[PDB]
Amino acid sequence: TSAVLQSGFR
Amino acid sequence: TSAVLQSGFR
Amino acid sequence: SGFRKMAFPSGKVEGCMVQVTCGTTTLNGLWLDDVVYCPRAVICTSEDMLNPNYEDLLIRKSNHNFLVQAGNVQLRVIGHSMQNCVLKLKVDTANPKTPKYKFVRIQPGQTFSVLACYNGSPSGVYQCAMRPNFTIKGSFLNGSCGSVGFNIDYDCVSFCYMHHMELPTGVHAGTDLEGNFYGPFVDRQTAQAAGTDTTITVNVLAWLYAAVINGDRWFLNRFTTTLNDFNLVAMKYNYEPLTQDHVDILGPLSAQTGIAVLDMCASLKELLQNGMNGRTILGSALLEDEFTPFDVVRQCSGVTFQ
Amino acid sequence: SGFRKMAFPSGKVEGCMVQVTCGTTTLNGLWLDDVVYCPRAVICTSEDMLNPNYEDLLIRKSNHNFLVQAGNVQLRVIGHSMQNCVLKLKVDTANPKTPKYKFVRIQPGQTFSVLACYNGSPSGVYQCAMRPNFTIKGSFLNGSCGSVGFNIDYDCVSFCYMHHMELPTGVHAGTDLEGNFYGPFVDRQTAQAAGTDTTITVNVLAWLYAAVINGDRWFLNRFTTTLNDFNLVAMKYNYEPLTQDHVDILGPLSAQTGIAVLDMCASLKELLQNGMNGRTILGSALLEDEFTPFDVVRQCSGVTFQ
């Protein structure tokens, strides 16, 4: 799989 | 052994 | 992903820690509004500690016999009273950093964060559980007396533990914030010993659910068990009896993972009978029992890694 | 007595956490003086993340495209710049809670406390090590990006980690506070993988010394070893080579316990060859490698339980 930038949603 | 009240010295 | 022993942010508690000194004896106090809470052991000297009469020791004290220091400010004590094994020192200044707070007496098997403190200065934070035998496996040195344990919910600090003493086995005993000891212990340096301890079964099950949430299923099996058949196995491995109340509390975790509670019990039964076979669960080679079901929901994703 | 994974009190860092939002993307920032530090990933949307050109994405932004919130106060951005993989947002208000601080880039094998944060709100604190492969085994969910790792010394917060991403193995990658990644990783959602990891040998030795300090000697033996003979055993168990610098760093712990460093290496060699025989050390069935020698001295008594 790919790396995940763990930003949030708003 | 005995219980120890873990107060400090000053 | 990941799963750590996670404590609550300690800042709201750090702002409440003070130093309380009576003569040559010093320890930590908890400054909330205009009251400082500390262990009554502060009014003893080394010759008093085997069988102190605290009522007799305290009536010989004046307000000015108590020196309270918040950082470098000295707080003047304008009143004092004893409640169980804590002293309540009325001070002339209300703590401007007082958080929203409650005093709570927790049940065994519940977890809390400990702010270890020395000379009124916080030194570290770690997570603890109240053992079934009402000790905690803390990390405390001389001078730690008065350090507090707590949980936080929506900016409300629920204080549940104030540290008093270390038992000969190296585990720790203390009180709620009203001064009532957890367990049968008393605040004197006598022959006392923690009773036989057991493993917190509902917490082990919660931690197995955390492992499934984070993507690991190797320990499951195709079997199930009755609650009574599980407890007969649990009892022979020194596990706490699992109750129907524990089963209900594991409801949300069972729903999120699709693993019935009694099915996870069958997995746990097999782990107890067979061991781990040199495998690990969430980075541990032992079955971990100091995460509550609430601790797992608070830390884990709401989405199972299926 | 006791020995816990102990984090630093987090209050000085909690006072610095803010929320940074660019459009629909939100994460955490670190508010020090009149600057907010956050990952540059905040300026991407879901369609940009596989190969963003951050320089091209950023020049299309104005100061008012960044919404910074500290609790409920909104901070106005009056300037912005990119440095490596962090953004520096100049705000109109200096943080009155700014602690004494430094930015430090740590070596692998060093430990730090992590303040996990979501929407600018601290949720928990735990202790981590920088693995030899420059990942950390954190516990992070979506929204944690921008959470910081730190150490504290004499009321000075040394920030050493800002969180960016999770790798397919569930471990975590991030930057120093200047925006330079630890390890070979880049802030884009591509095929990346942590390199092969090793065990931090000097930390395992420090933890064995902690066990002796706290009163346990069962794992020692009568043998010794040369440094080269130890490393040939360590290499076959995927342990980091132990250097003479590591031996010197273990000096104080060796002096406090009376156990020569190379003698503890012989104990460790035997533990690696024989296993633990169903015994535990400081409550662990595995050899623990996320305590530095400094961590042991900071937590343990200066007096060995002999």
Task: Output the 3-class SS for D64-109.
Answer: HHCEEEECCEEECEEEEEEECCEEEEEECCCCCCCCEEEECCCCCC
Residues of A in contact with D165 (CB under 8 A): 3-6
Chains D and C touch (3+ CB pairs under 8 A): yes
Three-state SS for D160? strand
Give the chain C residue nearest B9 (alpha carbons): C25
CA atoms within 13 A on the CB side of C53: 4
d(CA D150, CA D158): 5
Give the Cα separation of D25 and D20 in Å (integer): 8
Interface contact flag, A2 D187, Cβ < 8 Å: no
Chains C and B touch (3+ CB pairs under 8 A): yes
Exposure b/e, D178-206, CB count within 10 A at least 16 = b? ebebbbebebbbeebebeebbbbbbbbbb
CA end-to-end distance (rounded Å), chain A: 25
Regarding beta strands C35-39 and C77-83, do their DSSP bridges make them parallel or antiparallel, or are they unpaired?
Answer: unpaired
Which residues in chain D have Cβ-Cβ distances shorter than 8 Å to C116? 6
Structure tokens at C85: 């094994």
What's chain D's length in residues?
Answer: 306
Burial of residue C142, with CB atoms counted within 10 A of its CB: 0-12 exposed, 13-18 middle, 19 or more buried: middle
> Quick one: which of D149, D154, D159 has its CA closest to D101?
D159
DSSP state of D126: E
Cα separation, D26 vs D66, whole angstroms: 10
Judge whether D224 and D262 are in contact, CB under 8 Å.
yes
Six-digit token string for B8? 């400090």
For residue D275, give both structure tokens. Answer: 């296993």
| A1: nearest CB among D118, D168, D185 | D168
The answer to whether C132 and C200 are in contact (CB under 8 A) is yes
Q: Among residues D46, D40, D104, D38, which one has the least CA distance to residue D68? A: D38
B partners (3+ CB pairs within 8 A) are C
Three-class secondary structure assignment of C46-60: CCCCCCCCHHHHHHC
The C-alpha atoms of residue C263 and residue C254 are separated, in whole angstroms, by 10
Q: Which amino acid is at C155?
A: D
For strand D156-166 and strand D100-103, is the pairing parallel, antiparallel, or unpaired? parallel
Instruction: For chain B, state the CA radius of gyration.
Output: 8
- Residue C199 CA: distances (Å) to CA of C298, D24, D152: 22, 46, 35
CA C292 to chain centre: 12
Out of D24, D144, D191, closest to residue A2 by CB: D191
CA-to-CA distance for D105 and C267, rounded, in angstroms?
A: 44
B6: nearest CB among C165, C188, C192: C165
CA dihedral sign, ordered D14, D7, C40, C184: positive
Distance (Å, whole) CA D56 – CA D144: 25
Give B-chain residues touching C190 at CB under 8 angstroms.
Answer: 2-3
* D122 contacts on C by Cβ (under 8 Å): 9, 11
Find where tokens 């507090």 sit.
C148
Residues contacting residue C119 through CB under 8 Å, at least 6 positions apart: B8, B10, C19, C26, C28, C143
Whether the domain at C11-91 and the domain at C201-299 fall into the same CATH topology: no
Nearest CB to A5: which of D26, D118, D164? D164
CB–CB contact C49 B1 (8 Å): no
| Cβ partners under 8 Å of residue D120, min gap 6 | D17, D18, D19, D20, D28, D29, D69, D70, D71
DSSP secondary structure code for residue D243 in this structure = -
Amino acid sitting at position D158: S
Q: Are C297 and D141 in contact (CB under 8 A)?
A: no
Of the candidates C289, C127, C124, C108, the one whose C-alpha atom is nearest the C-alpha of residue C210 is C289
User: What Cα–Cα distance (Å) separates residue D99 from each residue in C7, D156, D163?
Assistant: 21, 7, 20
In chain C, the N- to C-terminal Cα span, in Å, equals: 13
With both helix axes pointing from N to C terminus, report the angle between C201-213 and C261-274 in degrees, rounded to the nearest 10.
Answer: 100
Find, among C205, C195, C196, the residue nearest to C272 by Cα.
C205
Q: Of D141, D136, D138, whose CA–CA distance to D119 is shortest?
A: D141
Query: How far apart, in whole angstroms, are the C-alpha atoms of residue D228 and residue C77?
Result: 63
d(CA D54, CA D76): 22
Contact D168 A3 (CB under 8 A): yes
Contact C9 D14 (CB under 8 A): yes
Residue numbers preceding breaks in chain C (C to N > 2.5 A): none
Task: Answer for the pair D75, D29: CB distance below 8 angstroms, yes or no.
Answer: no
Does D173 contact A at CB distance below 8 Å?
yes
Confirm if C131 and C187 have CB atoms less than 8 A apart: no
Closest partner CB to D11 (pick from C15, C166, C283): C15
Q: How many Cα atoms sit within 13 Å of D118 on the Cβ side?
A: 14
Element of type H or E holding D17: strand D17-22
Residue with tokens 């219980």: B3
C-beta separation of D140 from D116 below 8 A: yes
Asked whether the beta carbons of C204 and C274 are under 8 A apart, the reply is: no
- The experimental technique behind this entry is X-ray
Between B5, B8, B9, which is nearest C189 by CB?
B5
Interface of C with D in 96-155 (CB under 8 A): 115-116, 122-128, 137-141
Q: How far is C90 from chain B (nearest CA, A)?
A: 21
Annotation: CATH topology of C201-299:
main proteinase (3clpro) structure, domain 3 (1.10.1840)
Give the best residue of D3, D139, D145 to mutate against chain C (max C CB count within 10 A).
D139
Query: Residue D146: helix, strand or coil by DSSP?
Result: coil
Determine, for residues C6 and D141 on separate chains, whether the beta-carbon distance falls below 8 Å.
no
Chain C residues with CB under 8 Å of D150 CB are none
DSSP string, chain C: ------BPP-HHHHTTEEEEEETTEEEEEEEETTEEEEEGGGG--TTTSSS--HHHHHHT--GGG-EEEETTEEEPEEEEEEETTEEEEEESS--TTPPEEEE--PPTT-EEEEEEEETTEEEEEEEEE--TTS-B-----TT-TT-EEEEEETTEEEEEEEEEEE-TTS-EEEE-TTSPBSSS--SSSS---PPPP-B-HHHHHHHHHHHHHTT--TT--S----HHHHHHHHHHTTBPPP-HHHHHHTHHHHHHHT--HHHHHHHHHHHHHH--TT--BTTBSS------HHHHHHHS-SS---
* Count of pairs with CB atoms under 8 A, one residue in B, one in C: 70
Beta-bridge mates of residue C173: C165
- Identify the three-state secondary structure at position D32: strand
Q: Which of C21, C6, C72 is nearest to C207 (CA)?
A: C6
In 3D space, the residue among C234, C250, C166 whose CA is nearest the CA of residue C199 turns out to be: C234
What's the rounded Cα separation, in Å, for the pair D251 and D209?
A: 11
- 3-state class percentages of chain D: helix first, strand second, coil last, to nearest 5: 25, 30, 45
Best probe of the A interface among D20, D24, D38, D117, by most A CBs < 10 A, is D24
Instruction: State whether residue D118 sits within 8 Å of chain A by CB.
Output: yes
Q: Which amino acid is at D207?
A: W
Sign of the Cα torsion D265, D266, D267, D269 reads positive
Residues of A numbered 1-10 whose beta carbons fall under 8 angstroms of chain D's beta carbons: which are they?
Answer: 1-10
Whether A and B touch (3+ CB pairs < 8 Å), yes or no: no
Q: What are phi and psi of C58, to 5 degrees?
A: -80, -35
> Does residue C12 contact residue D147 with C-beta atoms inside 8 Å?
no
- Annotate C244-255 with b (16+ C-beta within 10 A) or e (fewer): eebbebbeebbe
Contact C125, C7 (CB under 8 A): yes
Cβ separation C39–B2 shorter than 8 A: no
Cα–Cα–Cα angle for D130, D134, D140, nearest 5°? 70
User: Would you state the structure tokens that stand for residue C302, as one six-digit string?
Assistant: 């709401």
Please, what is the end-to-end C-alpha distance for chain D in angstroms? 13
Quickly list DSSP for D271-294: HHHH--TT--BTTBSS------HH
Q: A5 to chain D, minimum CA–CA distance in Å?
A: 4
Give the number of beta-carbon pairs within 8 Å between C and D: 116
d(CA B1, CA C169): 9
Q: Which two tokens stand for residue C153?
A: 């919910």
Residue C247's φ and ψ, nearest 5 degrees, are: -60, -45
Q: How far from chain centre, in Å, is Cα C64?
A: 33
Q: What is the end-to-end Cα distance of chain B in Å, rounded?
A: 25
Neighbours of C15 (CB within 10 A): 16
- Amino acid in the structure at residue C182: Y
Quickly tell me which residue has 């693993």 as its tokens.
Answer: C259
Chain A contact for D150, CB < 8 A? no
Specify the resolution in Å.
1.7
Cβ-nearest to C145 among B1, B7, B10:
B7
- Rounded CA gap, C144 and D286, in Å? 29
Which chain D residue lies closest to A10 (C-alpha atoms)?
D24
Q: Which residues contact C120 (CB under 8 A, 6 or more apart)?
A: C17, C18, C19, C20, C28, C29, C69, C70, C71
CB nearest to D167's CB, from A3, A7, A9: A3
The CATH classification number of C11-91 equals 2.40.10.10
**Which residues of chain C lie closer than 8 angstroms to B3, CB-CB?**
165-168, 173, 185, 188-192
Q: What is the DSSP string of D177-196?
A: TTSPBSSS--SSSS---PPP
